């Protein structure tokens with residue numbers, strides 16, 4: 001298991017990164033410091049997570065301390081839905097750069113295919129409670145992303161939560177200049193994504209798996225929901241390998257040639273989650289984990305099901 005995967009821009013991306021959604025701002029600085037101290041070289045960020053400044057403090061300290069060189073880090077962020085308008089994309093990227101205290105991102109993603117009305121609110125609502133869309137075509141948003149590469153703000157651009165038809169739309173864009181390097185999508189044993197993953201990989205697009213542990217801290221969790229970390233079948237595979245269930249859940253996407261970004265703010269777990277380069281799941285283990293698919297989503301963007309570009313009506 002090599003530690004990085006080659007992207008279609010010629011750069012190498014670490015296959016394990018630290019997630020930061022829900023990481024409290026008073027804890028995420030230490031989380032990122034610990035992560036870098038124990039070997040992480042890839043941090044997954046987003047403006048909408050509201051903690052990029054605090055992530056940046058950690059990155060900057062570790063650069064200043066010479067624990068890691070900038071060229072060795074792979075920092076990812078994402079353009080929020082309210083910045084799809086072509087004239088807003090650069091400023092959104094620049095704000096993220098300023099908060100993260102960087103002069104470039106390694107990868108910048110369109111966070112969701114759904115554009116929203118610009119403004120202070122991340123989910124602008126009409127008086128009846130529906131999200132208010134933007135009329136900016138995603139192809140125009142993509143062109144604006146391409147400009148970021150050409151201005152040196154980002155090394156690579158990509159997409160997130162795009163279904164296969166939406167990926168195809170980008171790939172078929174008239175005058176396409178840079179292909180998406182990555183599609184970041186939810187992926188774990190309850191949402192295995194075989195169809196979308198094969199499609200992306202066949203086009204040379206690297207897939208990053210988010211919520212690999214099933215996001216037990218997701219805000220809308222219900223007590224009766226399925227639980228990957230508590231699934232006795234997954235626990236059994238872990239016990240066989242003398243690893244934790246989380247470690248199996250992280251190793252699983254790695255062996256599918258995916259990048260994976262487990263989130264933690266707990267120092268012991270941050271370290272545990274990185275200790276996944278010392279064992280191998282068998283083909284049987286892999287197919288067994290795949291068999292647990294139930295098409296269950298942590299992130300269904302339920303408030304936007306009426307949005308024209310809602311990604312999850314299509315089969316994949």
Ligand SMILES: NC(=O)c1ccc[n+]([C@@H]2O[C@H](COP(=O)([O-])OP(=O)(O)OC[C@H]3O[C@@H](n4cnc5c(N)ncnc54)[C@H](OP(=O)(O)O)[C@@H]3O)[C@@H](O)[C@H]2O)c1
Nearest residue numbers: 019020021210211212213214215217246262263264265266
């Ligand atoms: N592109 C998108 O739309 C999108 C959507 C969702 C997520 N993401 C990205 O993917 C990252 C990961 O997804 P996620 O945050 O939804 O959930 P996740 O990584 O599947 O799970 C995070 C949860 O698992 C716990 N945890 C972590 N390691 C553990 C371990 N070894 N043992 C037991 N529990 C453990 C964490 O607790 P503690 O933190 O308390 O230790 C936290 O409650 C996000 O943070 C974000 O960076 C992207």
Ligand SMILES: NC(=O)c1ccc(F)cc1OCC(=O)O
Nearest residue numbers: 021046048049050111299301302
């Ligand atoms: N998708 C959401 O509803 C969401 C909203 C705000 C936020 F900070 C995170 C979120 O989910 C995770 C994501 O979209 O990366």
